[PDB]
């Protein structure tokens, strides 16, 4: 009755099925969400980018925040592809921050472990921070990407 699995699920659910990165708010404003991309599609898709997430106050945005006038509909965006890494793309009207350091808007940046993005800068009382959790499993699969498969 899902009783046993429930035990394993809470203690540590099976993550990495197709999980790219996870967004967690540290300032306590937006609920945690899970970003993901299909591995088969990533390997099969030999293009520039595979799947990109858009975050902001927009209901369309892959990430819906609470309601910060300082933040834009789509404050920031995350792209997944290249080869076996992740990139962060800022897209806010006010700007996107990384550990206190403001990055170039609509610019691609190299992913960081447990990285954190700050937004709504201008007023110490109007800034919101977000933490990114990268799936170790995803990194492992990406490393092997296409299995040799011994015929």
């Amino acid at each position: 009755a899902t009783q046993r699995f429930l035990i394993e699920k809470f203690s540590q659910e099976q993550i990495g099925e197709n999980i790219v990165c996870r967004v967690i708010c540290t300032t306590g404003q937006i609920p945690i969400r899970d970003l993901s991309a299909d591995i088969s599609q990533v390997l099969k898709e030999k293009r520039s980018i595979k799947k990109v997430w858009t975050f902001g106050r927009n209901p369309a945005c892959d990430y819906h925040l609470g309601n910060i006038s300082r933040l834009s509909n789509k404050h920031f965006q995350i792209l997944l592809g290249e080869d076996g890494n992740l990139l962060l793309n800022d897209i806010s009207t006010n700007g996107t921050w990384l550990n206190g350091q403001k990055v170039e808007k609509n610019s691609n940046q190299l992913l960081s472990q447990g990285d954190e993005i700050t937004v709504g800068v201008g007023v110490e009382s109007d800034i919101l921070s977000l933490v990114i959790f990268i799936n170790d499993k995803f990194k492992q699969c990406l490393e092997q990407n296409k299995v040799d498969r011994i015929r």
């Binding site: 006038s69 933040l71 009207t93 700007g95 201008g122």
Partner: peptide
């Protein structure tokens, strides 16, 4: 009315 995102005007400091 509109809904322009409140953005500062400090020549992007």
């Amino acid at each position: 009315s509109l809904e322009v995102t409140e953005a500062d005007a400090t020549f992007v400091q």
